Enzyme design. Structure first.
Site, short mmCIF file in Angstrom:
data_model
loop_
_atom_site.label_atom_id
_atom_site.label_comp_id
_atom_site.label_asym_id
_atom_site.label_seq_id
_atom_site.Cartn_x
_atom_site.Cartn_y
_atom_site.Cartn_z
N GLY A 70 0.81 -1.21 0.00
CA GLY A 70 0.00 0.00 0.00
C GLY A 70 0.85 1.27 0.00
CB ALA A 71 4.11 1.72 -1.33
CE1 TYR A 74 -5.78 5.14 15.85
CE2 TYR A 74 -6.29 4.96 18.20
CZ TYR A 74 -5.37 5.17 17.17
OH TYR A 74 -4.04 5.43 17.46
CB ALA A 133 -8.06 -1.22 14.17
#
Ligand SMILES: O=C(c1csc(-c2ccsc2)n1)N1CCc2ccccc21
Ligand SMILES: O=C(c1csc(-c2ccsc2)n1)N1CCc2ccccc21
Lengths: 233, 238, 249, 237
Positions: D17-18, D144, D147
């Site tokens: 995911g860059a 949040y 996770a």
């Protein structure tokens, strides 16, 4: 008293032995109508006899918490014959697959019983963690971490509806699975417990009983550790 | 004798018992059958405690106690020992421009020193009986901003650590040490904003804290030690 | 008679800490010494403290022997007078310390007094150096955990809990001023005490550490060096555990 | 004293995911430190964009299409990397997946495990490794915090399983970062948010990347199972 569960139907999964059995009797003693589950029919029958033998109204059922079909069917069975369970206690249970499988079973069952709790605008979900018992420390600490996180989140999702969601994290408990660990490992485990003794199944059941009462109504998302002072991470 | 959650024959000491949570804890323990000794820092407050106990059919007394003083602690404890017996249930609820985010340290440090002072003194009697309950009550959320969150979270952090350690020191003697961490318990009409941080959508009642304490004091909570039970309706600030 | 203040064109690419003055307490041995050399290596002017004049001299020699500019000083963190005086001394001769590393602790009712005494010393020293960091609108306070692993299991979890809470709160009080406050929580580190354990018990200990080895003092020092850099500028209130995967609660 | 390896010269790093934000920043940081970087996206357009960015910044590597939810995608991609570039010994998981609270976290952790397992044969082989997992940047608090809880627990356990092999496993938990999601908040809510962050500002993507770069170095060799929070002092649990 104000510890009373008279008029409540409680569902306790994995209630044929040890901590599960102790939780079923405690809730029964407090006045709930108790439905205890096992995975076999022999175990469902044994639960029923135990409940009779202790003057507790209820039933034993066969339930497989890994199956959506088992969960749906069972829940419907309970609804028709006994009423809607508003107290649910999850005690029924490759480091990763274990934890991940368990939490999926928690979720599956939790979700299903929520329609009935929502409808009544009242509820208690209580999740029991794994007992410390001799790969072992890694899996224990992880299953505890996943439970603490899970319990906290679910509590947040359902709070507006007056439904508490909590956990109980046992330490080293005196049970059939722990009675026959080797002496060396037992003694080592005693040596890390400030109270100097194993916990009793009844001592877990008492905590669960309180979380189910109206007095624990402001407690939600909590994981109460019940381990005699021994904290393993 | 032997019953689920009876405290008949126990002497309980509840500090800061003249109002709110402290008062609620004193009546709860009295209701469960304990002989209750509630303290305040003033004589007016000691008198008010005595009346409340009498009015609710609870045997006990109100006393003046300053938990910041070794003399006050010694004297009071000796008074209790002579007249009533040895307290084996002790509940610490006595704790000391708008609030700011630099008040955190002195408050927390002072409280924990008082917790220790009192805890140590009552331990000789609990050791001697080989049974005990120490229960420490945290501070309720005190203010609406960051500065309010800073002090709350810190007082909680120190209490969790303190409670855990003391529990380890005294466990072999069958003495549990636990805490209760209140959230928002029952002005400016950011009321709605506050309720919106609390999953249950309401403030907690003082009685709801008192119930948890009552359980931790029972024989059923005998395997629970070093725990901090949060009682906050699902709102967790760290 | 005891002298309590002892001083002392190749440009290394590690030299990020740009003349800044770092103060490292308890820097005569082990982890403290390792931290002093690491910060020196990164280009800071390092002031390391001990409680005795012999220790202050030893620090000065070590710094000299490793090409690090700075000094060794006598400092007693339990004394407001020692803290004030020392800090004034540093200000006059070397400048204002904007990196401060608290590694001077105390060791062996003992359970409470240790933790409580340490945190009071942390606060005392932290408060004093803050005027200079405030004035520059930049700062690094780093607290070393005793939350040391060799200090052992019985008081470890508590000292860690108190440090983690403390660090987090102070970070909140001083954040608006661009000052980070962080902690490093060592596990089992290789020092002279831990080397001379019997094989039987050594092996047992290594069996609780996923990496299967003791940590080196240099490995703590590296973490500290990073927290002091500009890259760790958004890290504050954190307690970085450095324990090879062994987590005691 | 002055000469050591905080350099990554000779290391192949894989950053999932860059194509943007934090992922992109991590890819350039690792490249800057000397690694050969392979950055992944889920689309071919994104794989191309990664390649250009790496070229433009003088970083050797590649952009690839990778879907971390698919065993086939993971196997194939990894094999492709092994044949052409070598064995990735630094792996950074930043790719995520889309009453939604449980499925998100559960799906992500399954992807972490899938990918983690696959790259471990090569790290085992070399007896050295770095796995670093990036958390999600900020009902909002519930998702949040969860996770983060699941990541902390996951990271810690995996670290235990692989430690004997000299492989560290760590996480980075971003707070409020300046990225595409945060660029479009109302001033009222922005100001409120800044007021809960002791540093009084959003984090930069580069500031996450620096932490990752350190965890990948030899100096972070004794750090394993840790979740380093990078949030300017703002802690939601
Ligand atoms: O004495 C302190 C203490 C003093 S101030 C403080 C604190 C914690 C968070 S902010 C300030 N903690 N602690 C905090 C935890 C602890 C455990 C055992 C003995 C003492 C202590
Ligand atoms: O698989 C999960 C998991 C699935 S959902 C979930 C979770 C945690 C907090 S909220 C949802 N956690 N976990 C959570 C922590 C953990 C450690 C090791 C292996 C698996 C896991």
């Amino acid at each position: 008293q104000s510890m009373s569960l008279q008029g409540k139907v409680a569902l306790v999964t994995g209630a044929s032995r040890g901590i599960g059995q102790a939780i079923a009797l405690e809730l029964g003693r407090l006045g709930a109508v108790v439905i205890g589950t096992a995975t076999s029919a022999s175990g469902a029958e044994k639960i029923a006899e135990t409940l009779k033998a202790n003057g507790v109204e209820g039933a034993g059922l066969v339930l497989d918490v890994s199956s959506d079909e088992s969960v749906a069917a069972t829940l419907e069975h309970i609804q028709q014959h006994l009423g809607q369970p508003l107290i649910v206690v999850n005690n029924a249970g490759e480091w990763f697959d274990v934890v991940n499988t368990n939490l999926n079973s928690l979720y599956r069952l939790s979700k299903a019983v929520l329609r009935g709790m929502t409808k009544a605008r009242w509820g208690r979900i209580i999740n029991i963690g794994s007992v410390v018992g001799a790969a072992g420390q890694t899996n224990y600490a992880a299953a505890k971490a996943g439970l603490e996180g899970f319990t906290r989140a679910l509590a947040r999702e359902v709070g507006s509806r007056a439904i508490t969601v909590n956990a109980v994290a046992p330490g080293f408990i005196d049970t059939d699975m722990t009675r026959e660990l080797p002496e060396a490992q037992r003694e080592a485990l005693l040596g890390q417990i400030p109270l100097g003794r194993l916990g009793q199944a009844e001592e877990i059941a008492k905590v669960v009983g309180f979380l189910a009462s109206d007095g624990a109504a402001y407690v939600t998302g909590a994981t109460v550790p019940v381990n005699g002072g021994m904290y393993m991470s």
